[PDB]
Design a protein around this ligand. Structure first.
Ligand SMILES: Cc1c(C(=O)C2=C(O)CCCC2=O)ccc2c1c(=O)n(CC(=O)NCCOc1ccc3ccc4cccc5ccc1c3c45)c(=O)n2C
Ligand SMILES: Cc1c(C(=O)C2=C(O)CCCC2=O)ccc2c1c(=O)n(CC(=O)NCCOc1ccc3ccc4cccc5ccc1c3c45)c(=O)n2C
Ligand SMILES: [Co+2]
Ligand SMILES: [Co+2]
Lengths: 381, 381
């Protein structure tokens, strides 16, 4: 059931912004590890005396990395005279965020029809305002409300090229890396209490609960009208034999925040071949692979969707498989992206639900918690 | 002239420590960009609840990257019960350093015969103490005094494997990258006033002024007895037509600090081939290459040291060449390592002064300021 109750017109995920200590080093690491091209910049070389911001792209996926300069460079500016390209940026907020949480996502940005109306409707329906609508070069409007923790939901709307004041990157510095990643599928938050978090976000967005089918968590998914903006939220389950990874997250993150980004690949086999080649030479590491019993058990579960060879290809790459009533999910998880056991990445590809493919086809892999446990037991033997 | 006036026995450069916001991302970027292997770690997985520290090595070059965890993880510890492997580490100091200066060098570490005596003699001779001698696992002693700005000179001495509490890295995560870099040749600081900085450091070390032969700077080099520890220091020259890069550094760094690290390569041609291949795929960028007139002028200057082909190889890679009365220097400079126009790297190789090669053979390339200017004028034509 989908009541299509969005209180304003939402289009697609637009970008994800990381708040960093040094944007250059994080952006270069991510570019190589994920196969994303340097696409745009806003920094001292573009006249921005406030923050350094570098944009990476792969298909429609946009990752923005931002760090503050010394406040002394902009000490004579006021908001009316700012050289910042992102007017919501604040030195103190950024330093406080990073000192509290370490490297992580500050903004989950969605494109909307009218960012001013989305902001107004959101706040009228309980959203805590974070940054008011600001019109950039009479061309783009940006506004921000609190999502959870210190993560904001950023609304962006365009009259008619990322943001004004950003410059396209010199193609000598823009190597055309591409490992197959194409868009953000979903963005997942960890909170201490799922109920109040769901009520708050669904309250100001009108997003509905997305249909699904002790492992340490309870979760639910909020979805826009066409179910292409997907925002799962997790809470810990306390008292388990194995400590909840959600609780570990909350401890090391100093509270609620974004847990993982799920990145859709148009060819998850190529993406994982390319990412795994680079794990130990600057890229990203992956979770330990499931035992071979897991891949023998795949024949009975998805043998009508994947051939034996395609199943063997999943086994070589450590890919997990889950199934809905409508489709099939291929997924895999990285180790944490930075020092703290907090944020990580998921690579996914979805099979089925052709109408275009409907959002969320095959679910989110919750069936893989039980399958992994069974598989671990069976391999013990 | 070398009076050999060291007030304590100094051996060689031991390591360089960067203070980071996220050590993982900086270390992975540097590993790929410079061809350094992940060699050791001290972090949550080794029981360190205080800081994440990752060691990269290439030959005898040791780069350490350290970032603080949430203080909450160690809030019950005191110094007698600390799980930090580097007892001088302090959360507040590290966050303050990084917020003030951005990514940069906190510690220039030299190995000495006895770190406790070096500390005591240094402080008796004017050094400002930063961290007192602490004996680690009855095996290593570490002590720190102020060098310039918020950079410390760290003394390390060994009774008889980096530091106790560090663990060797799993060789699955330890890819054997190597682009030819072999050791730290020199480490250069920028200060507002050269005179007082020289008097202070030479005062507590006994290091002597190393012999040499308007560009925006005055410089001098302090050297240990065998001239293998080399510490140049720069001050700006004000009022020049082109603003001093030293003054720009001081402004963007919020004061004095480490300007560049010069890394000796055993094969600078291979090192630059490998580094330039990776510049736009996560590595380091290099300064703009000098015009071809510079390389035509090399025949008259070093045609007795480099063949035409070896000169052409310098031209393909953008390598600079300078000459002393004793030897020849091949050098090249990276663009800044992070967001701010502050710290950068120099790659060097020295030719001549065979006895082993004496320290500082061929100088530091000061002749290349004038040669570059002449070369730029000639290419204008
Ligand atoms: C995240 C996820 C999903 C998922 O998408 C999802 C949604 O979209 C919405 C619905 C709810 C939900 O779940 C589905 C299936 C998953 C997983 C998943 O995450 N996982 C495994 C894991 O645990 N991944 C994170 C691992 O965390 C850590 C990794 C590495 C470390 C290394 C050293 C460490 C040292 C000290 C403490 C540490 C704590 C946590 C550490 C860690 C520590 C899995 O198996 N399935 C099968
Ligand atoms: C450093 C050095 C040595 C050297 O070893 C040395 C010693 O060992 C001890 C004795 C004193 C000394 O000198 C020798 C020769 C050098 C150089 C050297 O450094 N150079 C060129 C340059 O300038 N390298 C740093 C470039 O800084 C910047 C690079 C890139 C940017 C990009 C964007 C920017 C935007 C805005 C502001 C910026 C400010 C500064 C920016 C910058 C800015 C050179 O040519 N020779 C020839
Ligand atoms: Co997911
Ligand atoms: Co130098």
């Amino acid at each position: 059931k989908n009541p299509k109750s969005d209180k304003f017109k939402v289009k697609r995920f637009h970008h994800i912004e990381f708040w960093c200590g040094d944007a250059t080093n994080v952006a270069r690491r991510f570019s190589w590890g994920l196969g994303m091209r340097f696409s745009a910049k806003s920094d001292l070389s573009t006249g921005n005396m406030v923050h350094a911001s570098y944009l990476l792209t792969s298909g429609d996926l946009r990752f923005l990395f931002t760090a503050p300069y010394s406040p002394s460079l902009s000490a004579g500016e006021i908001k009316p005279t700012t050289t910042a390209s992102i007017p919501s940026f604040d030195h103190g907020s950024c330093r406080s965020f990073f000192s509290s949480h370490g490297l992580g996502v500050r903004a989950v940005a969605i494109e909307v029809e009218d960012a001013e109306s989305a902001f107004s409707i959101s706040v009228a329906n309980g959203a805590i305002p974070s940054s008011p609508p600001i019109v950039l070069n009479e061309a783009v409007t940006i506004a921000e409300v609190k999502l959870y923790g210190d993560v904001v939901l950023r609304y962006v709307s365009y009259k008619a090229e990322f943001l004004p004041g950003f410059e396209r990157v010199e193609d000598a510095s823009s190597f055309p890396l591409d490992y197959g990643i194409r868009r953000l599928d979903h963005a997942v938050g960890n909170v201490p209490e799922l109920g109040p978090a769901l009520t708050y976000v669904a309250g100001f967005t009108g997003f509905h609960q997305f249909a699904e089918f002790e492992s340490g968590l309870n979760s639910a998914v909020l979805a826009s009208n066409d179910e292409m903006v997907l925002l799962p939220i997790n809470e810990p389950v306390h008292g388990t034999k194995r400590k909840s990874q959600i609780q570990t997250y909350l401890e090391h993150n100093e509270g609620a925040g974004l847990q993982h980004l799920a990145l859709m690949s148009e060819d998850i086999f190529r993406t994982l071949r390319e990412m795994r080649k680079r794990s130990s030479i600057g890229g990203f590491d992956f979770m330990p692979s499931p035992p071979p019993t897991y891949y023998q058990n795949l024949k009975k579960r998805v043998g009508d969707v994947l051939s034996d060879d395609q199943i063997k290809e999943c086994e070589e790459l450590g890919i997990l498989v889950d199934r809905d009533d409508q489709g099939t999910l291929l997924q895999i998880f990285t180790k944490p992206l930075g020092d703290r056991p907090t944020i990580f990445i998921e690579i996914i590809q979805r099979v089925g639900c052709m109408m275009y493919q409907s959002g969320g086809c095959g679910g989110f892999g919750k069936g893989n918690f039980s399958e992994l446990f069974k598989s671990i037991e069976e391999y013990e033997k």
